Design a binder for this molecule. Structure first.
Ligand SMILES: [Zn+2]
Ligand SMILES: [Zn+2]
Ligand SMILES: [Zn+2]
Lengths: 56, 45, 83, 112, 49, 65, 262
C-alpha cells in the first residue's frame, strides 16, 4: 500500500487554494516560489535554441 | 574571554574558558550571554 | 495473426486514445528532429505541428489494434476517419 | 515572501514606456492605448472627458488584473479624426479645470 | 469574497492590525558517551572539520 | 499594547489622548463616552481603539531585567 | 464656468467645503489623489543600538514608523533613488535620534518631542515632531523604568502612501452628494416606510426636497459635492488640496507629454 499501489513522489507542490474571478476556467495561479522550485526538462530544438539560450 | 551576566544579581562576570558555569558571589548557574555591541538595522514597514 | 484487409471488422473511426497517442508520439518525433511532411505556417511548438500533420493525414503511422483473442489489425492513420 | 514591492505600484519599470498605442482591428478607426503604473483614478477621469466629446463614438477602459498596475483604454472616433487629438483636448480640459480649481480654491481661502 | 473569503484593508495592515510575534526556541546539548568522546560547543573551522 | 499609534482606519493621531483620557477619568470621574467626546473623536473606528485597549505593558514592567 | 469652492467649516484639523460644478470623475479623482497621491515624511529605517525594553525591537520600529513628522518644504528634498550619492546625504533624508533612560523610581515616558534634529536642514522646516496635545507632550512612544536605556537613530525619508500607510497626511474624507434622493442612485430599504426610518443628513439644509407629485428625474446630473478634508498634523488642509490638484495636474500633464513624444 505504501510502496507499490501508492508512494510519495517528487515534482509536486501542496498549499492553500483560494479564488480569483479574473482567471479562466481551466487555469490555475501558481506562486513564483513554486515556479522557481519545480522544473521541467525540455529538449533543445532549433525552434527554441535562442529561447533556451536566453534561459541559460 | 567573553562578557557574561548573572541570572539574579545581574553582575558582570566576563569569565574565560575552563571556568565551568557558575556565578561569582552567588550560586546561580544561569549565565546570560549579553547582546551584541554592533548596530542592527531595521525597517519600519 | 494479422487479419487481412477484407476481414477488418473494427470501428473505422479514430478514437480519442488513438488520436492522443498518435499526436503524442508524432509530436515526440517532431521534437527529436523528424522529417516534417507539411509546410509550416510559422509554428514553433511540436504539438501544434503534430496536429497540423493530423489535420492533413500526413502522419506516417499505422495502428496495430490488438484483439482479445490475441490477434490484431493494421489500420493506417491515413485511412482512419478522424472526428 | 513573494509579494511585489510597494514602490512598483507607481514607478515605471526598465525598458517600458508610459503609453502603448496599439491599433485595433475590431472596428474601423479604433485604437487601444495601454496605460502603465496607473489605475481607475486616471482611467475614469480620462474616459469621462472622452465621453463629453461629440467626435468619439466609443470610449472605455478596464483594469485587467489588480496585481498589475495597468489599464487598457479603448477609443474609437469618427472617420477623419484621430483619437489622439481627442485625448489631447481631454488632457488640456482637465489641466484647465484643475488650474481654475486651484486659483478659485486659493482665492476663496484668502477670504477666511 | 466568495466561499468564505475575506478582503482586508492594506492600510490597516501597514498600521499594525493582527500582526503577531513568533518565538522559536532551539535547544542544543553536548553529551559524553563513555567519557572518551566529548562533544564541545565551539566555532568549527573550515580547514580541519 | 502601550497605546496604539495613529488609528487602524481613519489614521488620526490618538497616542497623545491616552494620558488626558485617564486624566479626565480619574479627575473628573466622567464616563467613557463623555471623555471620548472631549478628546475630539467623532467616529467609532477610533472609539474602538481607546475603548477596547488592553494595556499590558504595565504588567510587563513589573519584571526585573 | 469651472468648479466653485464654498468653505463651510475651517479648523486646524477638519475643514468641510462644497466642491460643485465638477463631473463625478474629477471629484472622485480629487479625493483619491488627496488620500493616496500626496507626499509625506516618515521614518523608513530604524537603527537600534541598545534596547532593554520589554517590547520587541521591530515593534518599537513599527511604532516609530507610525509617528508623523512635519513635511512642509518636502518639495525640494530629492528622493533616495534620485540622488547619486551612496546611501543618504543632506539632499535626500533627515537624521533623527532618541536617547531615553529611567531616572527616579517613577517610570519615565518617552515622547516624540525627545527626538532632536542633528542634521542640517539648509533652510527647510521639516523634521520637527508635530505636537497637537493640549498638555505640550508628544506621542507616548514607550515607557521605561530605572536601569533601562534606549538609544537609536532614525532616518526619515520621503515617500507617498502607496509605499506604506505611514505616509498618510490626510485622514477621514467626508464625501457626499445629492442629500434629498432625486438622482435615483440609491433605492432605500424600508421595513414600513423609508421616510420614518432613514434620518436626514446635514447637507439637506443647503438644498430642498424635490417635492412629491413632480415629474420624474432622468436629465439631471450628479453635482454639488460635499467634501470634508481632515489632516493628521503634517501639512495644513490648503497644502493638501493644492498639492493634490497639482499632483493630478502633473499626472495628466505627464500623460500629455507621454502622448506628444509618440
Ligand atoms: Zn550573581
Ligand atoms: Zn478611527
Ligand atoms: Zn543623496
Amino acid at each position: 500500500r505504501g510502496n507499490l499501489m501508492g508512494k510519495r513522489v517528487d515534482f509536486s507542490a501542496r498549499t492553500v487554494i483560494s479564488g480569483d474571478p479574473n482567471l479562466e476556467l481551466d487555469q490555475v495561479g501558481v506562486p513564483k516560489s513554486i515556479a522557481k522550485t519545480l522544473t521541467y526538462p525540455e529538449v533543445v530544438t532549433p525552434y527554441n535554441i535562442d529561447r533556451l539560450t536566453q534561459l541559460v | 574571554t567573553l562578557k557574561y551576566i548573572c541570572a539574579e544579581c545581574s553582575s558582570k562576570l566576563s569569565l574565560s574558558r575552563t571556568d565551568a558555569v557558575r556565578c561569582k558571589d552567588c550560586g546561580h548557574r544561569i549565565l546570560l550571554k549579553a547582546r551584541t555591541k554592533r548596530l542592527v538595522q531595521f525597517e519600519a514597514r | 495473426k494479422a487479419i487481412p484487409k477484407d476481414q477488418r471488422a473494427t470501428t473505422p473511426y479514430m478514437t480519442k486514445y488513438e488520436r492522443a497517442r498518435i499526436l503524442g508520439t508524432r509530436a515526440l518525433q517532431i521534437s527529436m528532429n523528424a522529417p516534417v511532411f507539411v509546410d509550416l505556417e510559422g509554428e514553433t511548438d511540436p504539438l501544434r505541428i503534430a496536429m497540423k500533420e493530423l489535420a492533413e493525414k500526413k502522419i506516417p503511422l499505422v495502428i496495430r489494434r490488438y484483439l482479445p483473442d490475441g490477434s490484431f489489425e493494421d489500420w493506417s492513420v491515413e485511412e482512419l476517419i478522424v472526428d | 515572501m513573494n509579494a511585489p514591492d510597494r514602490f512598483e505600484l507607481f514607478l515605471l519599470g526598465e525598458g517600458e514606456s508610459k503609453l502603448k498605442i496599439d491599433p485595433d482591428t475590431k472596428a474601423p478607426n479604433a485604437v487601444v492605448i495601454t496605460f502603465e503604473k496607473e489605475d481607475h483614478t486616471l482611467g475614469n477621469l480620462i474616459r469621462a472627458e472622452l465621453l463629453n466629446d461629440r467626435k468619439v463614438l466609443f470610449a472605455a477602459y478596464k483594469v485587467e488584473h489588480p496585481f498589475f498596475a495597468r489599464f487598457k483604454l479603448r477609443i474609437q472616433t469618427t472617420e477623419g479624426y484621430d483619437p489622439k487629438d481627442a485625448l489631447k483636448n481631454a488632457c488640456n480640459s482637465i489641466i484647465n479645470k484643475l488650474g481654475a480649481l486651484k486659483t478659485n480654491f486659493e482665492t476663496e481661502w484668502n477670504l477666511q | 469574497n466568495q466561499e468564505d473569503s475575506m478582503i482586508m484593508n492594506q492600510s490597516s495592515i501597514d498600521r499594525g492590525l493582527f500582526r503577531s510575534l513568533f518565538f522559536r526556541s532551539y535547544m542544543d546539548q553536548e553529551k559524553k558517551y563513555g567519557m572518551s568522546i566529548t562533544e564541545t560547543f565551539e566555532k568549527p573551522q573550515r580547514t580541519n572539520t | 499594547m502601550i497605546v496604539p499609534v495613529r488609528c487602524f482606519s481613519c489614521g488620526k493621531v490618538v497616542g497623545d489622548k491616552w494620558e488626558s483620557y485617564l486624566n479626565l477619568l480619574q479627575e473628573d470621574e466622567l464616563d467613557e463616552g463623555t471623555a471620548l467626546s472631549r478628546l475630539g473623536l467623532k467616529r467609532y473606528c477610533c472609539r474602538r481603539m481607546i475603548l477596547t485597549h488592553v494595556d499590558l505593558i504595565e504588567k510587563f514592567l513589573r519584571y526585573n531585567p | 464656468e469651472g468648479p466653485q469652492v464654498k468653505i463651510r467649516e475651517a479648523s486646524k484639523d477638519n475643514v468641510d467645503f462644497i466642491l460643485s460644478n465638477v463631473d463625478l470623475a474629477m471629484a472622485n479623482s480629487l479625493r483619491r489623489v488627496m488620500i493616496a497621491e500626496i507626499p509625506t515624511l516618515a521614518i523608513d529605517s530604524v537603527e537600534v543600538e541598545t534596547n532593554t525594553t520589554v517590547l520587541a525591537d521591530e515593534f518599537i520600529a513599527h511604532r516609530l514608523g507610525l509617528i508623523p513628522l512635519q513635511s512642509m518644504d518636502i518639495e525640494q528634498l530629492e528622493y533616495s533613488r534620485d540622488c547619486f550619492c551612496e546611501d543618504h546625504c543632506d539632499k535626500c533624508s533627515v537624521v533623527l535620534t532618541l536617547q531615553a533612560f529611567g531616572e527616579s523610581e517613577s517610570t519615565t515616558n518617552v515622547y516624540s518631542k525627545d527626538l532632536v534634529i542633528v542634521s542640517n536642514l539648509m533652510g527647510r522646516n521639516i523634521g520637527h515632531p508635530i505636537i497637537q496635545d493640549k498638555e505640550g507632550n508628544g506621542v507616548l512612544i514607550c515607557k521605561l523604568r530605572k536601569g533601562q536605556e534606549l538609544k537609536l537613530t532614525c532616518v526619515a525619508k520621503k515617500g507617498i502612501a502607496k509605499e506604506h500607510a505611514k505616509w498618510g497626511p490626510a485622514a477621514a474624507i467626508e464625501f457626499e452628494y445629492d442629500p434629498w434622493n432625486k438622482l435615483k442612485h440609491t433605492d432605500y430599504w424600508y421595513e414600513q416606510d423609508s421616510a420614518k426610518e432613514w434620518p436626514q443628513s446635514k447637507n439637506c439644509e443647503y438644498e430642498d426636497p424635490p417635492n412629491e407629485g413632480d415629474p420624474f428625474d432622468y436629465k439631471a446630473q450628479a453635482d454639488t459635492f460635499y467634501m470634508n478634508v481632515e489632516s493628521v498634523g503634517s501639512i495644513p488642509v490648503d497644502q493638501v488640496v493644492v498639492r493634490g490638484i497639482d499632483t493630478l495636474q502633473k499626472k495628466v500633464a505627464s500623460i500629455l507629454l507621454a502622448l506628444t513624444q509618440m
